Design a protein around this ligand. Structure first.
Ligand SMILES: [Mg+2]
Ligand SMILES: [Zn+2]
Lengths: 83, 208, 99, 124, 138, 184, 71
RNA sequence: AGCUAGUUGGUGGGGUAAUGGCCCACCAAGGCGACGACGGGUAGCCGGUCUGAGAGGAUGGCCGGCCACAGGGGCACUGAGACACGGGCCCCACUCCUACGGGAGGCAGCAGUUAGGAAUCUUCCGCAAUGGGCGCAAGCCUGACGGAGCGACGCCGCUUGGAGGAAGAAGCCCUUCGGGGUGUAAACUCCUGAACCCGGGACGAAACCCCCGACGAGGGGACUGACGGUACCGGGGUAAUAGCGCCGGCCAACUCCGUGCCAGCAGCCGCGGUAAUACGGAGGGCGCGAGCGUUACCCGGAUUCACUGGGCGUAAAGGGCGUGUAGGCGGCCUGGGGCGUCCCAUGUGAAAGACCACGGCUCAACCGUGGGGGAGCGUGGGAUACGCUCAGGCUAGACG
């Protein structure tokens, strides 16, 4: 299936995560469909995490089933919140 | 690693004053004045005509010594300069100057470049809040260096300040002599620095 | 957009099959000069409607045989057999230089 | 000549001659020294030059030069081969690297020790 | 067989320049004429004209020459130092807008055959259309 | 570093106290028989110790070696022109505590006109390098307790070198007694 | 270091051999390949098969020596 | 240099998720080839990397994709998907037991063992993060991964002090005997304080979980650390590893002793046979520096395979000539078509890199964010100068 998931890049002890859309059976670094956002765990930057919302929503609609952490991140950003 | 070891010998080798001690390297003592010739035996000998390569090499060495850096680092800096657009020589020089130690030396925080570097290493030198201990720290313009909180009451620093009390600083620099502060303002151009080095020769040497 | 090609019917020696010479003029990747370079394609003709010495429009298609992956779209112009003749001559020459 | 000609046949790319067959372009091949002997050099040069017929891990029976002021090499000595020619000697393309296996370091070297594999002298 | 006409014309021009002859006569072509016009505009030649020698249409070319150089090797100075047919037949070079040459860094000129007509390097750049790099002229 | 310890019963042991025979895996080189095993705080220290030991031993060995071809004018000549021909042999045993024994046994068995020579004596399996060495030297490969690897054995067979495999020391000794010959 | 471990033995020249070298039958033993001294070459001392010359043998290989003394 | 016999096409059927010579029956006799087939060798391929002014040239390590193989070969089964790395069956090869009838195996997973070999790590800790799978869930599993260990194997960062301080100690070295060199180097004064010890001490980890809200959005709660008591901060606190190459020209840097075409060096010219700026040492220098040199390969220089940008009277090089096939190439004008060619637009050209900008790790490497570029390739439109093609004419080529 298709998942919204976090791809580790970066350095040892300096992790960086790509909030990304990809197939379930892939390398956690692998050929992903689209880069929707990015997240730094270490909170080192002011704009530490950011995801484009509309694209994410579209993906969800299509049926992109997110990872739990990813979902949390999305919620934090303001994707799942509706009015 | 540093050069480490005998200093004014290098100056002697070039034949132009290199100011690698500050004082004494100012007085009749740098060995430029007492003896002006290259070191070791055949220094006082007949000076033979040097090859085109050789002169350039000498110039490069002079430069490196003046800035007190490892060759690899120097090479890297040069490469970076080349990559950046402008005047590959002047820009390179500016970049070199931007080395924290050099800046410190200029601001009269320490009377010698090696001394300045040492000071920087031993947490005595602070760049906008944090004590920075690596002289390879490159400073981008409009930025503040200061003698550290807990190093403000040490004798050497005071002496340095006194020495630089009265005598003025470079146009790219400003220093607060009261509170041991020093802003690096402009990025230092070649015209500002009346250095004995010719950058062109260095560039040529590097080329091939 | 299926690959649509221009070429001449060089051989009708088999049932339902037309052999088509497609001549492509591409420049050399290094020397910058155009090489008039040919390739043979075996095309499906369900009627034998097409004949020796016809220039036709050949479409990339779903396969009908092992290297017969082309449908014949339409006939462009019929009777410029000169090219065919040239090809034949070339073929004949190919026989010569064996032993 | 003409570009057309080139197109037709192409420039025959230079098959660069492999100057040393220590196999694979291996930097160092270990060899068993078959027979160590001395050699008369060439027309412009004269010396009893020290050499060893060494057989290899590859299966190659070669001649190999011994640098150093007097060898230590036996008759079934374990050696490591440098390669890099000698302009004097016929059939000989290999240095023997001194300071390994059974070729011990040159005694009483103090300047160019690295090439000949002798350890730092203990100063007084 | 005269195998390239443009190239031949160029060669003739070069020969004329070498020899210090004021005017030469090259066979008639529209393309050739255009090229000549371009050259004239640039200033590389003094002028051009079409005439008829025998019963064949022909193109007279007025060669421009520099002032007499005083002293050793007393020849006048050359205006067309060098010409080259770049787009040689069966080699035929074509350039895009990005690959337009600034030959002699703005001093020498290339002439380009283009969709928008036969035209100069500068003109090509302005118009933003690549084409056939027929001839290098300096 | 200790990888595995296994008693004589055939059981895996994670912990072994004072006085138990353990099959200790984890030594980078095969240590000598009756070698005193010692504990170290870290690895670097151990390495340093090893280096020091090597320095102590190796230098001395070198020195010992060096006082042998003293005179090269006449003595060397005497030593190069050999009257009684020597037989070369290269041994490979199963343990350190058998190879030595074998050597001791065969050092006596040398009174004959043909004098036996040991060029390479190590514990373990024969290989193609060994075969190569034999070819170079005209030497025999003898094995006690260790069977030859298949490839190695094949190589030995085809190249034409003496390959030997044994069950008892006595057998080996007997075999050796045939190698001096007589011609007449 | 410079190792003078060389045999300086007498020999009669026997065979006219290659590369400024003469097979000389030794009184220490065999006929070897022993080549001329550079000094001799410089002086242009011509040698015939039948001179009682001194040979400098190096013990590493007794194959090659050196014709040192003038006859 | 010819290759082909399911081989090339057909009709019918089988088989497939599906086309197809994938397979079979039958008819036909084709198909490919010098625009290089078939054969041999070689080789995973690329995104890239290294080099290079560029064009190119070499390489495909790590990282990313795709393929292929899981001792060798063959073949199916089950399923969404395998012809199935830690499933199956079978033959062979090999190792392992056997009560000789038979079974067990497969590290090209991590670690490790050997063996080859110049040479390559730890039988490490952890599910904490991310991801995987299963599960309502907790949670279980995870040699993916996160980290730690070893190796100067790369690359980067810092230390081996700094400031004084002789018209110049000793030591050593040369000298023309005055002197010079090492060298402000040292010693010695002053100052700082890696190491080191204490005191604390992380970011990374906020969720899934529970409760309120409808099990939605939303609100609060709590737990959860291999790295690691590490990084890092606060206090103290020692002056605290310098080595290697070379020093005749290239090529930076020179003297003396010893040696005597010997011993040696050498990458090339070549140095060495009694005053060697080329050998051994010593001083002195110079290059770099926790490294430096040697070796091996690759590119460069090498415009020594030349497209950009080489030539062929005598250097290596014009075939011995003729006719002629492919092929390549082509006069002038007018008109179309628009294949090349150019252009505009768009789509692609993934990410990582490379480039620019800023930002994080005290700098830098490293990484992150954003941006631009990017040959090529498709699609749509346009342009017709120049090739290409069609049509018409011309007379300078050529032929009669
Ligand atoms: Mg001697
Ligand atoms: Zn000074």
């Amino acid at each position: 299936m298709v998942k919204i998931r976090l791809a580790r890049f970066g350095s040892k002890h300096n992790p960086h995560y790509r909030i990304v859309v990809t197939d379930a059976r892939r390398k956690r670094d692998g050929k992903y469909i689209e880069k929707i956002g990015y997240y730094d765990p270490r909170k080192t930057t002011p704009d530490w995490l950011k995801v484009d919302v509309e694209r994410a929503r579209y993906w969800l609609s299509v049926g992109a089933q997110p990872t739990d952490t990813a979902r949390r991140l999305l919620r934090q950003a303001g994707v799942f919140r509706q009015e | 690693g540093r050069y480490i070891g005998p200093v004014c010998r290098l100056c002697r080798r070039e034949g132009v004053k290199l100011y690698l001690k500050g004082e004494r390297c100012y007085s009749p003592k740098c060995a430029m004045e007492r003896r002006p010739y290259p070191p070791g035996q055949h220094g006082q000998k007949r000076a033979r005509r040097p090859s085109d390569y050789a002169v350039r090499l000498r110039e490069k060495q002079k430069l490196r010594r003046i800035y007190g850096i490892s060759e690899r680092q120097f090479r890297n800096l040069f490469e970076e300069a080349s990559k950046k657009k402008g005047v590959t020589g002047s820009v390179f020089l500016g970049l070199l100057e931007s080395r924290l130690d050099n800046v410190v030396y200029r601001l009269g925080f320490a009377v010698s470049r090696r001394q300045a570097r040492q000071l920087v290493r031993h947490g005595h030198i602070t760049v906008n809040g944090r004590r920075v201990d690596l002289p390879s720290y490159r400073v981008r313009p409009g930025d503040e260096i200061a003698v550290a909180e807990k190093s403000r009451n040490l004798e050497l620093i005071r002496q340095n300040l006194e020495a630089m009390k009265g005598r003025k600083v470079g146009p790219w620099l400003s220093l607060d002599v009261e509170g041991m502060k020093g802003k690096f303002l402009r990025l230092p151009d070649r015209e500002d620095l009346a250095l004995p080095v010719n950058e062109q020769l260095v560039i040529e040497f590097y080329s091939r | 957009p299926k690959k649509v090609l221009t070429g001449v019917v060089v051989s009708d020696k088999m049932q339902k099959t037309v052999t088509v010479l497609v001549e492509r003029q591409f420049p050399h990747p290094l020397y910058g000069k155009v090489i008039k370079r040919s390739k043979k394609y075996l095309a499906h003709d369900p009627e034998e409607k097409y004949k020796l010495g016809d220039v036709v429009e050949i479409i990339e298609s779903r396969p009908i045989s092992k290297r017969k992956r082309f449908r014949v779209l339409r006939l462009v112009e019929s009777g410029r057999m000169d090219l065919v003749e040239k090809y034949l001559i070339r073929r004949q020459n190919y026989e010569s230089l064996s032993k | 000549p003409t570009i057309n000609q080139l197109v037709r046949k192409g420039r025959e790319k230079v098959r660069k001659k492999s100057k040393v067959p220590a196999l694979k372009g291996a930097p160092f091949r270990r060899g068993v020294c078959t027979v160590v002997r001395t050699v008369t050099p060439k027309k412009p040069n004269s010396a009893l030059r020290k050499v060893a017929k060494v057989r290899l891990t590859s299966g190659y029976e070669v001649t190999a030069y011994i640098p150093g002021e007097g060898h230590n090499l036996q008759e079934h000595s374990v050696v490591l081969i440098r390669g890099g020619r000698v302009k004097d000697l016929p059939g000989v393309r290999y240095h023997i690297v001194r300071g390994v296996y059974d070729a011990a370091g040159v005694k009483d070297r103090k300047k160019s020790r690295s090439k000949y594999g002798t350890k730092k002298p203990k100063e007084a | 067989m005269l195998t390239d006409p443009i190239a031949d014309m160029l060669t003739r021009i070069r020969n004329a320049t070498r020899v210090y002859k004021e005017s030469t006569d090259v066979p008639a072509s529209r393309f050739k004429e255009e090229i000549l016009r371009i050259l004239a505009r640039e200033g590389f030649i003094k002028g051009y004209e079409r005439v008829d020698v025998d019963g064949k249409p022909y193109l007279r070319v007025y060669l421009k020459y520099g002032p007499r150089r005083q002293g050793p090797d007393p020849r006048p100075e050359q205006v067309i130092h060098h010409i080259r047919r770049i787009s040689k037949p069966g080699r035929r070079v074509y350039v895009g807008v990005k690959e337009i040459p600034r030959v002699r860094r703005g001093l020498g000129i290339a002439i380009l055959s283009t969709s928008k007509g036969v035209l100069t390097d500068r003109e090509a750049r302005k118009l933003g259309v690549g084409g056939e790099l027929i001839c290098e002229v300096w | 570093r200790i990888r595995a310890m296994m008693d004589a019963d055939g059981n895996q042991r994670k912990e072994a106290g004072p006085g138990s025979a353990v099959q200790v895996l984890g030594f980078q080189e095969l240590p000598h028989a009756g070698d005193v095993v010692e504990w170290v705080p870290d690895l670097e220290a151990a390495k340093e110790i090893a280096e020091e030991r090597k320095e102590e031993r190796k230098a001395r060995e070198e020195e010992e070696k060096a006082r042998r071809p003293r005179t090269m004018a006449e003595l060397l000549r005497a030593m190069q022109e050999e009257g009684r021909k020597e037989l070369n042999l290269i041994l490979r045993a199963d343990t350190q505590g058998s190879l030595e024994a074998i050597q001791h046994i065969l050092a006596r068995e040398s009174t004959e006109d043909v004098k036996i020579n040991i060029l390479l004596a190590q514990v373990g399996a024969p290989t193609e390098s060994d075969v190569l060495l034999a070819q170079t030297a005209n030497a025999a490969i003898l094995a006690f307790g260790v069977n030859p690897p298949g490839s190695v054995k094949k190589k030995a067979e085809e190249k034409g070198v003496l390959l030997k495999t044994f069950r008892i020391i006595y057998d080996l000794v007997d075999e050796v007694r045939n190698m001096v010959k007589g011609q007449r | 270091a410079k190792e003078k471990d060389t045999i300086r033995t007498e020999g009669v020249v026997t065979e006219a051999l290659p590369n400024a070298t003469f097979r000389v039958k030794l009184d220490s033993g065999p006929e070897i390949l022993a080549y001329i001294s550079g000094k001799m070459r410089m002086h242009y001392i011509r040698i015939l098969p039948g001179d009682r010359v001194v040979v400098e043998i190096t013990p590493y290989d007794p194959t090659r020596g050196r014709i040192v003394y003038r006859k």
